[PDB]
């Protein structure tokens, strides 16, 4: 059980106009740039999953136990 | 049910296809014979143009489809003669054979072979025979396929060259209205890499004829109103060379590329005063290129025709540049003296004169800013030399009993009086300017930096008022005598008068509004380049603004005069690095929309528009961002005011619903200035507008903002009977519309609505399409920007000048060598034509008709009679030379 | 100040002076479908970001049910006491009714249709337009295509009627001088 928080803030802005156009251009703004100013960002992949194989299939209980 | 008694050729046209792919196999007769007389029918009745259903196509569709599609690629033996009347004659069928989705199947028959010319048996046909699906497919296929691998196989190569025959048929066709139809092929085709296209068509124009460029050159002109902004300048300078390469006309050069300068490159307008030298080689192709060189678009250009032939032939610069000015300003003198200029009018204030009787008894006014108010309306209409001789003594008077900003202001209305003046107006001011008082002194200089306002000339760039400048002792004596020299060279970008004004800044005086007032005369001076200028003034920002909160004129001077040394460029990379040199505070963030939206003079862009009322939608804006919406809503009105005029009505069908009756502060405060600066004619749709929510003040909202909407009730120049509003709302104006609050505010509007009779007209729009300069001051004048408490002190010094990009109101007049002739022509209303065959009535209402040098008017085109030929530009300009010519026995 | 212009114009933009299949015309109707896209937008989102309300000072729903729900119309012809007006209902039955505070005292003026209570049946406010849908459906809102334009030549019968109807409007300062009414 957790208390949460949620709020609304904003209402959707989809103008499609001649923007969609300037889309084509807007990226390459990007590719110009993207790959020279950073190469060397990154985060480890696939040690999140080395929790689930540990299950501990055999579960300790201490003295006073409740059990199903 | 119509079949029978002629169906013969769904017989007999019917088998031969039937076996056809028998012709293309063992049998070469029918290969070969059967494919002719296949061919020949084909075109025989596509070739004319009598029967819109081809009577062949429509009986074979059905089969006819599955007959080309098993036949071409089943066939396996392509001989050139057999393999080419198969494309032949299964290319043509398509437009028929498949419905929308077939630019994928344009060349599923053509590309398989080029039998020979496929404008062959296209080439007398209009829109007919294979130019429409041709022109589809190029406009289509060539830019998926060019998209992003432009340089690929003949979807290049051989695709232009498609291209240049097909504008070729598209000529020889018929030469009809289709050829504005030949530069849609021309933007479709090569869509990124335009320039082959226009270059093309410029060839291909330069051996068709030199009359009929004209109408193609109107065409692009008028399509360049508003497309992509890197394409608007390939169009702009493609138009550039077209009187040129084909038509030698050449004398239009001149007018449509200074609308080049600032928006499209500084080296292109470099280009231009290249080609501007280069030309003018006639006498007369020099003087009426020069007369709107400095007069129409901007200064700073008497330095750029001092060659070696400075006798006559570069002696010209000095004549348009001042020697010009003053020879119009006699002209403006001659003829109003003439026409309707009465010496010393002064009634328009007088014209209270019926309400006498009405309400009671007078004797009610009593207020010493009303002396103020009244100066300013007796300098205001008293322009174009209306000067008064010890009728402004009621001045000195006042000016010995209170408001020493009001006797400031009283001061310098002299300087309005006697504006655009060189002969004597210093003279007539340096009599009172040695008067021992700073607050005379300063109004003193202010006056005389005015009068030599917009000549630019060397007469006294610096003598007078920098020498008292260099002597700042006092705190008010130091301001103006800069603020005006930043008006007197405003048109000039000279950078010893930026590094001497600099100083001003640097000399860290107490006085934050001399700061203010350098920061505002540096913008004002140069319009264009000197980056230094905007380092140093945000280096003066950050060392002083951060240890302050206080009132918007830090807002008002700094981020104002940033824009304007950087204003009206769409590179957007200086917005960029202004807005990375600044992130800071939201305090100081107000300044950034102000910096976004300033370098967006004018042009169409859709998204930009879209942010900015996105930027200050709502927000709910808990006293947060009210000078960001303010400044938004105040902007919005720019990039905005060239939007081919449809924008103009749908921007006041916005404002007139979406802030006026759902608004909370920016709404009910800053939505006038926008009507305000949307437009100066006067219109009843505005002019009813602005009273309905401004007469009743709704004093529940910040009452004060409907007096800002008075002084846009003034926004219309050109006096009429809506002072018959205005004064009804000054009787009322003496209990509501508070006095106290909003009185002087009444009485400068109704002292300029019907201000100046001569030089009325002051909106920026020298020539039909053009907004060259003149925009920077009226920008100052309306960035109030709420805070009138603020502005009731500061006006005194500033409001006299705060506009001063006035222009002379006629526009009609011989300008002969002499100004022998007078007049023969027909005043009328806006044009009545754009692309007609048919003869071009410009002149919708030629019934008005004036033979005199009398004024122009804002709705009014002139056409000329009696065989002159008006050799000099033929629309107006206000000293065209209009030679004559008559070889017409 | 009356209700004023009221004016009666959709009339947005004709500008399709091409007339034909040009670009000009693509791009210009282009422009204004998306400044319409924008505002309908801009009115979505004054819509949905309304994050204010209370809205009723603790007595509107105090008065909102002092006075009945399902509130009735009737015509006030007499005002003999102040506290103690008469009115009548539709079928002409009279009632010595009394008037309630929380009522601009103020406007009332015999003729004029006043809301009434059920069950004690007194006044409780001012009923502020009453037009029947006979007269509003006459009214104009939307202006028919055409102009001068299509029409074939009627010179002098154009000149006439602009002198009449029109002209007096937009540049009324001749017929003062004059000193004349214009036709009607």
Redesign the interface.
């Given at each position: 059980e957790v208390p949460k928080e949620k709020e609304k803030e904003?209402?959707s802005?989809?103008?499609?106009?001649?923007?969609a156009?300037?889309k084509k251009k807007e990226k390459e703004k990007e590719k110009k740039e993207e790959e020279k100013m950073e190469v060397d960002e990154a985060e480890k992949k696939e040690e999140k999953e080395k929790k689930k194989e540990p299950e501990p299939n055999f579960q300790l209980l201490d003295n006073p136990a409740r059990v199903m | 049910m119509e079949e029978g008694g002629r169906d013969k050729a769904p017989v007999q046209p019917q088998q031969s296809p039937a076996a056809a792919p028998g012709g293309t196999d063992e049998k070469p007769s029918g290969k070969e014979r059967r494919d002719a007389g296949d061919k020949d029918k084909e075109q025989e009745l596509s070739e004319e143009d009598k029967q819109l259903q081809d009577e062949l196509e429509m009986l074979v569709e059905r089969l006819g489809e599955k007959d080309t599609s098993l036949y071409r690629p089943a066939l396996e033996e392509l001989r050139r003669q057999i393999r080419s009347s198969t494309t032949s004659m299964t290319s043509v069928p398509k437009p028929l054979k498949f419905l929308r989705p077939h630019y994928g199947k344009l060349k599923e028959i053509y590309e398989n072979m080029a039998p020979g010319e496929n404008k062959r048996f296209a080439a007398d046909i209009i829109s007919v025979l294979a130019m429409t699906m041709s022109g589809e497919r190029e406009c289509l296929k060539y830019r998926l396929v060019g998209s992003q691998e432009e340089l690929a196989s003949w979807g290049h190569e051989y695709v232009r060259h498609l291209a240049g025959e097909v504008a070729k048929e598209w000529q020889e066709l018929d030469d009809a209205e289709k050829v504005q139809r030949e530069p849609l092929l021309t933007l479709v085709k090569e869509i990124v890499p335009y320039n082959m296209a226009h270059n093309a068509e410029h060839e291909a124009c330069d051996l068709l004829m030199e009359i009929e460029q004209v109408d193609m050159l109107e065409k692009d002109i008028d399509e360049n109103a508003y497309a992509?902004v890197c394409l608007y300048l390939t169009s702009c300078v493609n138009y550039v060379p077209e009187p040129e390469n084909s038509a030698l006309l050449r004398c239009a050069l001149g007018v449509f590329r200074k609308f080049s300068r600032f928006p499209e490159a500084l080296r292109l307008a470099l280009m231009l005063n290249d080609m501007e030298l280069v030309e003018d080689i006639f006498t007369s192709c020099k003087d009426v290129v020069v007369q709107k060189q400095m007069a129409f678009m901007l200064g700073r250009h008497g330095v750029f025709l001092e060659l070696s032939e400075d006798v006559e032939e570069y002696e010209d610069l000095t004549e348009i540049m001042s020697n010009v000015q003053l020879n119009s300003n006699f002209l403006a003198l001659a003829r109003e003296l003439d026409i309707m200029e009465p010496k010393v009018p002064d009634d328009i204030y007088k014209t209270h004169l019926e309400n006498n009787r009405f309400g009671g008894s007078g004797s009610q006014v009593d207020s010493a800013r009303m002396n103020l108010a009244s100066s300013f309306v007796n300098g205001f209409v008293n322009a174009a030399f209306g000067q008064d001789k010890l009728l402004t003594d009621d001045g000195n008077k006042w000016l010995y009993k209170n408001k020493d900003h009001g006797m400031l202001s009283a001061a310098a209305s002299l300087g309005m009086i006697l504006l655009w003046d060189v002969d004597g107006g210093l003279t007539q001011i340096d009599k009172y300017l040695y008067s021992s008082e700073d607050y005379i002194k300063s109004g003193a200089l202010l006056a005389c930096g005015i009068v030599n306002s917009g000549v630019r000339n060397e007469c006294d760039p610096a003598l007078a008022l920098l020498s008292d400048y260099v002597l700042h002792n006092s705190n008010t004596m130091r301001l103006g005598s800069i603020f005006g020299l930043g008006l007197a060279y405003a048109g000039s970008n000279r950078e010893d008068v930026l590094t001497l004004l600099l100083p001003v800044m640097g000399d860290s005086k107490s006085s934050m509004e001399v700061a203010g007032v350098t920061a505002l005369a540096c913008g004002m001076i140069a319009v264009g380049s000197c980056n230094g200028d905007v380092t140093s003034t945000i280096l003066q920002t950050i060392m002083e603004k951060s240890e302050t909160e206080l009132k918007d004129t830090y807002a008002r001077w700094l981020p104002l005069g940033l824009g304007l040394n950087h204003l009206g460029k769409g590179e957007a990379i200086e917005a960029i690095l202004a807005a990375l040199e600044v992130v800071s505070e939201p305090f100081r963030s107000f300044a950034n929309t102000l910096v976004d939206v300033c370098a967006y003079a004018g042009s169409g862009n859709?998204?930009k528009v879209?942010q900015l009322l996105?930027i200050c939608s709502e927000h709910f804006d808990s006293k947060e961002k009210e000078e960001d919406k303010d400044k938004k809503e105040k902007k919005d009105k720019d990039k905005k005011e060239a939007p081919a005029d449809m924008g103009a009505h749908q921007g006041v069908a916005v404002l007139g619903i979406a802030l006026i009756a759902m608004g909370e502060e920016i709404g009910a405060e800053m939505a006038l200035r926008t009507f305000g600066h949307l437009l100066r004619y006067g219109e009843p749709t505005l002019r009813r507008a602005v009273p309905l929510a401004l007469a009743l003040i709704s004093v529940s909202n910040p009452r004060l903002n409907i007096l800002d909407t008075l002084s846009k009730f003034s926004h219309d120049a050109d006096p009429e009977v809506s002072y018959n509003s205005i004064f009804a709302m000054g009787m009322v104006g003496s209990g509501t519309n508070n006095a106290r609050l909003a009185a002087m505010l009444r009485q400068l509007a109704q002292y300029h609505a019907k201000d100046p009779n001569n030089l009325f007209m002051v909106r920026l729009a020298q020539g039909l399409t053009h907004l060259g300069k003149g925009t920077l001051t009226l920008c100052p004048y309306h960035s109030d920007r709420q805070l009138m408490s603020q502005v009731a002190v500061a006006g005194l010094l500033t409001v006299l000048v705060s506009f001063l990009d006035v222009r002379n109101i006629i526009l009609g007049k011989s300008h002969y060598v002499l100004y022998g002739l007078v007049a023969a022509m027909q005043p009328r209303m806006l044009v009545t034509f754009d692309e007609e065959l048919r003869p071009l009535p410009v002149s919708v209402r030629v019934g008005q008709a004036v033979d005199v040098v009398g004024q122009a008017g804002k709705p009014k085109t002139i056409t000329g009679f009696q065989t002159h030929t008006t050799p000099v530009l033929l629309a107006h300009g206000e000293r065209a030379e209009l030679a004559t010519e008559e070889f017409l026995p | 100040k009356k209700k004023t212009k009221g004016p009666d114009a959709a009339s947005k933009l004709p500008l399709v002076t091409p007339h034909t299949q040009c670009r000009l015309k693509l791009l210009k109707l282009?422009r204004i479908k998306?400044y319409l896209?924008?505002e309908e937008?801009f009115i979505?989102?004054q819509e949905?970001?309304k994050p204010l309300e209370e809205k009723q000072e603790e007595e509107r729903s105090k008065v909102d049910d002092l006075r009945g729900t399902p509130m009735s119309v009737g015509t006030l012809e007499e005002i003999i006491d102040d506290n103690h007006a008469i009115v009548s209902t539709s079928v002409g039955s009279e009632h010595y009714v009394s008037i309630l505070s929380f009522v601009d005292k103020d406007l009332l003026e015999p003729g004029c249709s006043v809301l009434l209570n059920h069950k004690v049946h007194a006044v409780i406010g001012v009923l502020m337009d009453d037009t029947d849908p006979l007269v509003t459906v006459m009214k104009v809102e939307k202006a028919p295509q055409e102009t001068y334009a299509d029409i074939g030549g009627l010179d002098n019968q154009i000149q006439e009627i602009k002198e009449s109807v029109e002209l007096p409007l937009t540049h009324p300062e001749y017929y003062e001088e004059m000193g004349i009414k214009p036709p009607k």
């Open positions: 904003k209402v802005t989809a103008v499609l106009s001649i923007t156009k300037a | 992509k859709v998204l879209q996105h | 282009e998306d896209l924008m937008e979505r989102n949905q970001m």
